[PDB]
């Protein structure tokens, strides 16, 4: 009986714009009369459940049980407890869901680095990296937009957060968006959206352009002489 | 009896980090045992209703009650009804406020405008404006932060939304942050934050500084008289 | 009751080069004995109000009043009282129309702002705004002129005056001009004029174009 109730990630919270709690049974024979429900503080019980599949190649009952509940309820510590009433165990399988309060809350520092000059000289592609550093919960979401329109998820790839060597509490992550080199030369502005809990507005946007790392000063001095 | 309530705009709920709506009753006699609550169409009212204001000396109430309500439930289209029971009106008075449905949801087109040279040449101050235009509906919230830190609301003021001349459906707004010239000389982010429901992430951030724009300056210092005609 | 006595703002007197007094009749019987006051302190009667409004659908009667009063006489501070002799009230309602005096006059500091780089990069429309700062009181009739010919009122929108955050006495105003990007690229010597009483000539002009907004870039030096 593997009731792995993994809380949805913050990227999943701002991806589908809905908080779906997870209480899924793994490695168990599919049976009937399973009355799953969520019990919280003050005895509230609101639930809608779908995605029930009788047959599985691994002989594991799905019992996905995804319900839409407001984010403020999670922010209030409602301790969402799953109550899977399986036949073998008459007592409901209690699995609580709550945010691990007590962790450090450091806002990320978003830096939109310009593409390398040699790669643009190669005239093949233009990969703009979005270096996100300094976040303790390590729950970061990176999304790219062009002219205010979000791009397809397959154009940009985001690496999983990993601990920072200098700061043990803080974490860092990176993501790259690959476009054509003349697309970069066109003058389009790319915005990197970084979603995190510690941010005052929960998101942060940085804009990159052709004129973000150009040489502000040219100091050419043409000196010509006819003597040794 | 002028019955009216102020619906919680997106700007207010974005500023307060919570969704709360007020029930307001005007031109009624001063009786005790006030029972006002926002009843959802399923028949379940608000949990708590506190912070009721005190009557004006002119025998007119502007009392407002606040409660914690889910934002998804409000903006999904579910209308909220306020029940008003009092000795003056034995029949239960009802109120209704709800955001309009079917209105065009177009993202704002934010273009921050750097200040002109002459305001910098004058030594009094510098004004940085964040031109927000082409957004529907009219409601919008503009916030200014410096280096990721929120600034005081007294420094920046947001203009009231007005329709765009080209398109009647869209609207445009202004927000000016007045800062000293020496602050503009130093490198500061001075981020402009625009909040709107039609945006995907609901927040648009733009940055500006002294090095913003700044076409490349050339310093050609050529020496040619050393040849002296071979 | 209530009467919509709207004093003529500085914009109205600036546009028509004359003062057009307005005292809108509201909340009165449509076809009852009505006597609106249109006399000065001395009692002289102005010319009869023109363009009388028709019968409003509700019980309230509507009427548009106009008058031709001078500039300094209207600035002299005499009282233009609006009172109506009507049978629905035993006593007539008085709402005097007069300029409020004692307000400080501050010279506006207008500074036109070039269009943003992102707007010039996306290239859908070009919005040129004329920022008005440090003007008091809250009155403005800022305009927009194209190559010497003023643009249509519909093209430009003038924002309502609001108190300045740093200076409570002073106010600010906005006036955007939505134009084509190619028009800005070609250069149409757009100009902005702002109307205010505190200026020595009541209006000042600022000129902008594409070459404006571009500093000196080419510091080529010839030395011997
Ligand atoms: C540019 O070059 C000149 C000499 O050619 C030098 O004196 C000057 O310091 C240089 N500019 C900067 C910013 O260093
Ligand atoms: C431009 O060149 C002149 C002549 O060499 C020099 O004196 C000046 O400092 C330069 N300006 C810069 C480098 O900003
Ligand atoms: C331009 O060049 C002259 C050459 O003498 C120099 O004095 C001046 O400082 C330069 N200005 C800039 C902004 O580089």
Swiss-Prot record, chain A:
Residues 1-102 are annotated as: CH3. It comes from the Eukaryota. Residues 103-212 are annotated as: CH4. N-glycosylated; important for IgM secretion and its localization at the plasma membrane. The interaction with FCMR is glycan-independent. Residues 8-98, 108-209 form the Ig-like domain. Glycans are attached at residues 51, 58. Disulfide bonds join 23-82, 130-192. It is linked to Agammaglobulinemia 1, autosomal recessive: A primary immunodeficiency characterized by profoundly low or absent serum antibodies and low or absent circulating B cells due to an early block of B-cell development. Affected individuals develop severe infections in the first years of life. The basic structural unit of both sIgM and mIgM molecules consists of two identical heavy chains and two identical light chains; disulfide-linked. N-terminal variable regions of the heavy and light chains form the antigen binding sites, whereas the C-terminal constant regions of the heavy chains interact with immune receptors to mediate effector functions. Constant region of immunoglobulin heavy chains. Immunoglobulins, also known as antibodies, are membrane-bound or secreted glycoproteins produced by B lymphocytes. In the recognition phase of humoral immunity, the membrane-bound immunoglobulins serve as receptors which, upon binding of a specific antigen, trigger the clonal expansion and differentiation of B lymphocytes into immunoglobulins-secreting plasma cells. Secreted immunoglobulins mediate the effector phase of humoral immunity, which results in the elimination of bound antigens. This is Immunoglobulin heavy constant mu. It comes from Homo sapiens (Human). The gene is IGHM. The chain holds residues 222 to 433 of 474 of the full protein.
